[PDB]
Structure formats: structure tokens, C-alpha cells
């Protein structure tokens, strides 16, 4: 909101629209974790921590009093700075449709990388455990791409034996995705068989994920909480350059660590 | 004043 | 109902909902026999036996009197105990969404195993004959997974020659299911051909079934009668633990033993 | 109707329903000829012969008179006896749902065999010529199952050259059906290609047919006339057994003998 | 008083 | 007071 | 109309209906040219020639006068005689449903052959140029059936380079049709790929065409004009035989000779 | 409009319709660039240049004044002459339906070639940069046709890493198109797999494009501006010939040069 | 008085 | 007075 301070920027409204559009297309295209996990909607700049509902025993307490401490997970506030030329942004008021906005795309992809790598592989400095590093199940080795169907079925069986039901999604890192969607077994495309074995939507390509992943879609296992949602704010400017940032506040919780199985790349 | 991304699925 | 004694448990209503939800997802996902057989709806705690309509001659009877005894099949009442921590259940009143409920899942899968293994392979102690052990037809050997189409057709022919018509379902045990849905013959997926040969629904994966099974879906051959349906009841508690159970009363009848053919695993 | 004399049988109405249901499921499942030929609807017990509209010259006639005899095809009345236990039938009044009715199924399949073998291969004692034995076209040899597409096309061409147009059905005997629906050519299922080459309905499996058959579905080539349709009647009973029968009156006519081509088994 | 089969196609 | 499973198909 | 003189024939109305039905089924099934070319609707017995709109310079003309002759294409009137037995036709008034009408089918197929062979290969005696003999493009050699996709694409390219746009139809002679619809390449049916490469309707099988043909369906390239449409007329009768004919008046024009490419048989 | 001067031509209205129809079918069939790029609608004969919104510093300027020059891209006006016989055009007033119009098709295909070759490969004399010659990404070598899936995925990845999102189209030159749509890998058609990997519409065949192309369809990267749209105008005539032209005014802009990847032919 | 075939496609 | 082609997709 007013923490973004956008009315102080030397930017015309149509250039603000161009910046927002550029960031928005990247975010809608590339945010993979938000496609897969439960979303606790944006709560604003004041939301500070997620209540886990848990209690921790306090050490050195007397005998006539029982004392316990509430547990929370504080949110991380993330800012990715970027810089734009003021003349390039003035161009759009003269009717230019392609202002130089590559630093917007750079900052948006960096923010996507931060969020998705926290969701899939954790962010220890933010106190975040990811899906892959928190699963207790043994990682399955997928020797070749043609082994993906068997592996998927095997992973589903593992999830079934741990009590994790629900439709199962296959999430592919970039290399696994490209190899799977190029592969044929005696001409028949492997991705067709694999798609028949999982949830019927398009398979999620997750740029931040190493290898592949099979996870439950029943809900309630993985929860991303957003405070301030992805925003563009103004920081500073001089005569020629304006400094902006991408801002988000969020945290990610693994509620059920055994709801995913990691597949080693094929 | 966010970009309005929200949940994507 | 009041035999479950749930109002005496030291459990808040939302923790009761969490326990019930956990058991319910497992039951809706994993109960294979209830997907395949006729269901004689829940009759309550007072239903004791199924009337078969049959009579048995009584030995040592005089000549001016004909005496016969009615035949019934009494229901089995099954209880699977499990234990929960009271603090874990109090957590949900503090807003926790993932209380430790793995013993609920354990007990629910144990109950699923009991019911499904009675339906498919019998439960002699309960006086229950299962589908596989009551069929007179010779079991077909499926040498490899690619033999499944032929075997299915062969089984259908057998059922046709015994007078058993009706659409035919293929029911797969875990190993047969995984091998069938991973298999390709020169790249073409075998499960596609097999699915074209049987009833068009998703093939039932039955965890309790050994090998595979071809059975008629015309109705009236296999009947599961439920008295008290799957329920969670309260037994006892101390300061730290609460003892609950999964309860069900049921019996299973094979009305037409020749309505199924057993396939030896592929 | 009253020739069935069912009100004289020592059978309760629900046991009559069970007998009729048992016969009806077999008839609806297994009567293959009635799926393929024109049906001249049931005319009752009084219908005696089909008028062919033809005339035959009478020998030894004078010169001032021309004399000719009308041609008809008389119907055959067919009865298949079967016997049931009276106690088994009384069981259903006590609530039994699976009375011993295997002789009903035996008699119904015997009647199905009689009708279908008359339609496909003729019944000389009844003055019936069948589809296969009346065709003038040379029978095609199908060496292997993978030759079925070519053969089908070849048969269609033959039917086209004889003036027989119309969509063409492939009718398979049991062995040809099972081999075709199990067969793959380099993994690709042969039955898929064959189904693309013929009328789009499910291919008819005819238990009474030897080999396979390609026939026109334009109509007007093959006509089954029914007088009394398939019925269950009562004949006699003693203290323990009741004698029933399956009854039908029918005849089958080949109007266009060159409307089918016989395929030798694959 | 027949089984009511009739024409099957 | 059951879980409400009933018939599954 | 009254040139058919049908009211003078010793034929009952239902026998006339039977004759017309027999001819009509053959015509609707086997007339391939009428499925592919523009149809200039029936104009009746008085229509004599098609106006081409062209002028031809007249030789030996003076210098104060310019003289030119209009060009027309006169229609051909075609009659195919056939003979029926009068007793066979009287049979239908006695209720016979299969009178001997093989000469009707013979005459109808002969007429189909005449029309379609004029459309595809020309009829010089009638002043008709056909599609195949009027194309300037070089005929493509299709070595084997598996070469049909490439050939089709090649033919389309040729038609594209000559300015002939529009969706392209593949028309198959009998041998090419049967070979294409029986053929598999490593189990995959060739006709499936070919059908994906052309207009989505069922591929036309043309009995009168040698080899195969790729032609534009944009319209305006090939025009069949009908005067008197296909009719059955009466010629003569004696005590035992009646002489009838199939009659049609028509001509065929190639407006754009380069709108088709001929494929040499596979 | 009146610059076409059509009312001065010795051409009857139906011959004008025939000429326009001939040009229009070619244009709607063969204009590939207009299927792929943004279209800035026809602005008429007065539109002279596209405003790019950019400014260029002016050399040799004083110190108390800042001076910059607006940048525009002027449109190219393109005329393709062709000649028709006046007698051929008079033929259509006499009812001829196929006047000699091959020079119309020649001129229309020449104009299509000019526009599409400017869009794909540039037109330096008109100050136009094309899609292929302006991309910074390295061209991918497609060794064989069966490499097209991998290449497509690889190209998409490249476009993803440059910030170019959006659904991706595969555009094929003539040789690549024909090879792709004829190709099979163990019988399975390669084009089927490729079509599953891209936007679901029919793949664009671009006659003017060398090799193949993967480009974003998000919009805003490639902009064709039309002033006077494709028109037929009259230039001159003598007693026997009339001179006409195809006219268009247009320019093409690459707004985002990195939104396409070039594939070297397979 | 024709058979009424006409255009077939 | 153009042919009316316009945008083609």
C-alpha cells in the first residue's frame, strides 16, 4: 500500500502499468509452488507470524506452576531491487510500446526463484523447511526417462502406505520435464502414459526443483502463507535512474512431511 | 497495492 | 450411536472432526470390496444375522412331524483400538491444523484390511467365505503382464459358459496393478488395451487381493451386509492418553460362487 | 399365454419372477442372430407359416387351366424342458435370493444355441437355410489374426461387386473373437484397426458361428419371424420336482443369399 | 405371456 | 453416528 | 417425366417402388464423382447444352465485320437397358419382399460406371474431358502404400504452387483404397496418418478411378451438369418379360485442369 | 479507394468480382505472417509512418538547449503489376465462370512473398528487420525430423530464460513442414507429439520462412502495421490488354527481438 | 419423375 | 476499397 510509496516515483501511470504487466506475466507463468500448495491469502503488511497452535515446555519452572510457550513461524519480508532508466519510462508517454524493462523481468524471476526454492528445498535463514528436504520417504532413483511410469506408481504406493491418500501430482524440474516430454518408447510418447497415471491437469514444470516430485493434492499438507503479496514499490531516484523493488512477505509450512516422495532426475 | 497474483491453483 | 460414548471423551468437537476426517479419507480411498459387491445398507446395532432363506433338515425326528431349522449368517462385530495423545488433540483448539493422528490412520487401514480380506479371501473365524476361495473355476495363470488381455478374455469366456452374464470387472491386487499400469508392449501401454476389454470405469486396485480377479457386475452374486457402519468410538482415557476404536458390524455372503475367476499374479 | 399353463404350477410369484429374470438375462446377453437380422415381430400361437409370395407350377395340369401352388415357410415350435426342485423355489418365499436355477440357465442356453445355429448354419429338419450355408460367395481363408483387416476389406469388395451395398458388420465366432481382441501387431491392437474398418457398434460375438462372417446391415436380406416369443411354461410336477420348458415358435428366411461372406477361422 | 425379448437390434 | 461411508459403487 | 412412359408398364406400384429402391441404394452408395464435383442441378429433358461463355473466331470473314461463334458443351443422353420377369414383379403384389431384381442392380452399376468413368477419365465420344486426363501436373508415383502420406503432401504442394488453394481431398481407386486401409507401419495404421493430412470426411473410394487422386475442394474447378437425372423408364414388354432402362442426361466440364494431381497406384 | 481508379477500367462488375475473389482466396490461404503477429489495422492511404515513441540525440547542439529528434518507421508502398486480356474478362458477362486469371494469382503470390519475406527475413531497402534476422538467440540445429520435439522444448527453454513467456508457436518452412507431417518414428507420427508440445492450433506453414521458428504468442513482440490494405487497382489499358496492380502499404516492427528462436531445417 | 439422387456432397 | 484481408489470426 503506502509502504510502496509509488506516488513519489517520477513514473507516469502508463509506465507503472507497463512495469506491473511485465512483472505479472512472469509471476503468473513461473510461480510453481503456488500452483501446488494451499494458499493462506494475503493478510497485509501487519501480519507477522503464522500461529502453529503448538506449545513448547519451558525449562526451569517451579512445581506449583505449569508454563509453556506458544510456537509461531514468523514471516520473511523479501525485497529484490532493480533499476530503470527514467528516459525509457518517459518513452511510454510519447507512445512507445516496448520500453526497456529487462531489469523488471530479472527481479521478478529472482523473486520467483526465492519463493519456489524456499517451497521446494527450504530456506534455513528464514526458518523454512521445504517439501523435498522434509520428506522422510527414501528418494526414488529414476535411471532413465522410460522408468518414469513405474517410479510414479511406486511413489504413489509409498504415499498410500504412509496413510497419505488423495490424487497425486507429478512435479518435474526442468531437465526431467524436457526429457519426459521429448521421450518416446518405440515411438509412443512416454509423457502420454505418465499423464494417464496422474492428475489430469498439465504437469507442473518447476524451475527451482531438482529432479522430480510426487505429492498428494488432497490438501492440508503444505501451506504457503502470504502477508504482503508480490508488489512493486519505489525506493529512490536520481536524474537518470529510478530504483524500484519487488516486495513480498511470506512463509511456508510443511504440515505433513510424508506427503511427498522425491524422484532422482531422469 | 499488490500485483494481485494470489493462489495460482 | 450411544454405544460409541463419544460425549465422555476428553476431546473438543474440532478434534473429533479431525479424527473423523482422517478415518473417512482412508475409508473412501481404500475400501475395495465395497466398490464391487452389493451393499445391504447399515441396519444399526440391533441387526444380528442375515436371513439366507434356507432350511436344514433336523436329525432324529419322528415320522408324524417334519422339522427343519432356519439358516442365518450372524454378523461379526469388529473393533480396532487406537490411542491418541490428549495434548495433541487439545492442539486443534489452539488452532493447530496437523495434530498427530497416525494411529487413526493405522487403525483405519487395519479395519480396511480386515473387511477387504474377508470379502476377497474369507474369514473362517467369522464364518465368511470370500470371493476367491469360493469360486469353482480353475485359476488362470498369467505368465507375464502382456498376457493380461488374453487371460481377461479367457476368464470372460469361462464366466459366459457357466451362465454368468453381465459386464465383467477386472480387479487387481497391488503387484498386478502396478505391473499392468507400467507395462508397454512395443511402446503401446497394455493397460489401454485391457481397459478397452472391460467395464469402462477405473480399474479397481484392491490391496487385500492376491493376484487378480475377473468378476461379474450384473449384481446379486456377492452381498456385503452392514449393521453398524464404520464408526469411531471412545473406550477409556487417563491424564495423557485417550483410547478410541474403529467399530463395524458386518458379514459377507457369496450368493453365486461361480461369478468370479481368479488370475494368478502377473 | 394360457398354453404356458403357469397358474397350475406350484410356484410362488416371486419364484416365477426369479425364473423369468434368469432366462431373460441369458437371452438378452447371448442371442446373436436377433442382433443382426430383421425381426418380424411376435405374432402369437396362431401364426403358422410365413408367406413368401411365390408360386410353384403344379404338375399334370390341363391346357384350358393354369394352376399354381402358393409357397409358405411353416414355423418350428421348439420346447426345451428343464426341471426345478420345489423346495428351492419355496426358498424365495422365505427370503432366499439365490435359489438353485442352473437348469433354467442350461435350458436357456440350449434354446439360444438352437435359434442361433439355425440362423447361422441352418436347420434342415425345420426347413431352414442359414446365412453361412446359403451364401454363393467363396469363403475367405484368414490365415492369421493379423489378416483380419485385409480379409474384411476383401469381403466388403466381394459384397460390393454382387450389388450388395450397405454398411457391413463383422460377426465373430468365439475363437475368432478372442484371438482378434487379444491380438497386437507390434503392440498396436488389431481389433482397433478392424473396428475402424466396419460399422461402429461393438463387434458381435456369436457363440454358434464357426469362423467369422461379413454381412450387410442395409436390411431386407435376412428375416427372422417369431410367432410365440421366448417363454417359460409349466408342464408337470410331482411332490419334489416341477417340469418347465422354454418355448418359442419361429422360422428364419434368407431373402438375399449373397449378402454375406464367410471367413475361415483365424 | 412371453419373456418379452423381441428384436435385439 | 457412523462415518457415513455406505456403498462405494 | 412422361418420356419414361411408366404408366404403360405391366408393373404394380409396389413393384415400381421395389425397382426404384434397388436402383437408388446403388446410386447413393456408388456414385463417387457426384460426391466431389460441383453439381448443376437437374434441368429436365429440354436442357441441351452448357453455355461455356466462350467465343471462337470464325474463318473467312470480311474486314468490315467481326464474327464469332458461341461455344457450348452438349449433354449426352445415356440409356442402360435391362429386363425383368413379369411374374417376379407380380410376386410383390402377393406379398413377396425379395423379387428377382439383379438386372436392375446390373444396369444401375453400369450407369454408375459410365458417369464416374466420364468424370475421372473422360468420355471422348461424348466430348467430355475427365479430371485425370486433363491435369497438366506430372503424375506422382507412389511406390508403396506407406509412401501415401509423403505423396499426399507433395501433391498438395504442387497444387499450392499452381495457385490452387482450398482443402484437398484424397480420392482412392479400389486397389489403393483397400491397400491403404489394410496397411500398418510398425503396427500404426497408415490410413490414420493420411486422414490427419486431408479433409476430415471419410475418404472417397471411387471404383472407376485408376490409382489415386488429390484434388481441391474449394469449388468451381469441376462441374457436372445434369439435365434429366437418373431415372427408370419403360420401353417394351411381351407376355413374360418387361424391358426397362436407366436414363440420364449429363455433361461434365473441367473448369480448372490444374486443380488435381494423379497418384500412380500403391 | 479512388487511388485505385477502378471505375476507369474496361471491366464489368462481375469480372471485378472474379478478380477480387481470385486474389482474396490466395491471400487468405497463404499470408503466414498475418497469422502470427499483432496487426495494427488498416489506416488508409494517408498513414505514412509508425510512431516508435523514441528519441534520438541530435549532434552539435548548444549547452543551454537540449534537442532530440523523434523516431518513426515510414511505411512502404508496394505495387505488383499484372495484365489481363480484355476478351477473357468480357467472357464472364457472357456467362463464363473460368476466365483466364493466372496473372492475378501470380501477382497475389508475389505480393504474399514480399510481405511474408519482409516479416520473417527482413526488407533492408524498406528499413524492415525481420523476426529471424533480429533474434539474438543462437539458431538451433535440427539434425533430423525426429529431433523436432527436443528442439522445440529446447527453444521454449531458451525463450523462458530470456524472460519471454507465453504460449509458443512452431512455424515451419515448406521443407520442414512436409518432412514433419510425413515423418513416423516406429510408425508413430512425429507431428502428433510435436502438436502436443505447442499451441493447439494447426501448425503454420510459412512458404517464405527458411527452416523453422519457435516464437511467443503472448502478443506485443511483433507488429505489422497496415496503411492501405491489399487492394486491386487499375493502371492502364489498350484495345486488348488491361494493366492492374496489387497494392499495399505496410511496415513491420520487431518490438522484442528475443521472442523467437530459429531452427535450422530438418 | 427421376429417382431424386441429385448432388451427393 | 481494399480486398478486406486484415488480420488473419
Residue numbers in the entry:
A (entry chain E), C (entry chain A), D (entry chain B), G (entry chain C), H (entry chain D): 1 to 266
B (entry chain 5), E (entry chain 2), F (entry chain 1), I (entry chain 3), J (entry chain 4): 917 to 925
The paper states:
Encapsulins are protein nanocompartments that house various cargo enzymes, including a family of decameric ferritin-like proteins. Cargo enzymes are directed inside the encapsulin nanocompartment by a terminal localization sequence (LS) that binds to the interior face of the encapsulin. EncFtn oxidizes iron in a similar manner to other ferritins, but due to its open structure, it must be associated with an encapsulin nanocage to act as an iron store. Together, the encapsulin EncFtn (Enc:EncFtn) complex can perform both the oxidation and storage functions of classical ferritins. Here, we investigate the structure of the Enc:EncFtn nanocompartment from the halophilic bacterium Haliangium ochraceum to gain a better understanding of the arrangement and stoichiometry of the complex.
To capture the extreme open and closed conformations of the fivefold pores, we performed symmetry expansion on the I1 particle set in Relion3.1, followed by masked 3D classification without alignment centered on the vertex. The closed conformation has a fivefold pore diameter of 5 Å, while the equivalent diameter of the open conformation is 15 Å. To understand the structural changes taking place in the transition between these conformations, an atomic model of the encapsulin protein was refined against both maps. In addition, our focused refinements of the pentameric subunits allowed us to build and sequence the 117GSLGIGSLR125 peptide from the EncFtn protein. This region of the LS forms a network of hydrophobic interactions with the inner face of the P-domain of a single encapsulin monomer, with further stabilization by several water-mediated backbone contacts. The core GxLGIxxL motif found in this region of the LS is conserved between the H. ochraceum EncFtn and other proteins in the family and is observed in the crystal structure of the T. maritima encapsulin.
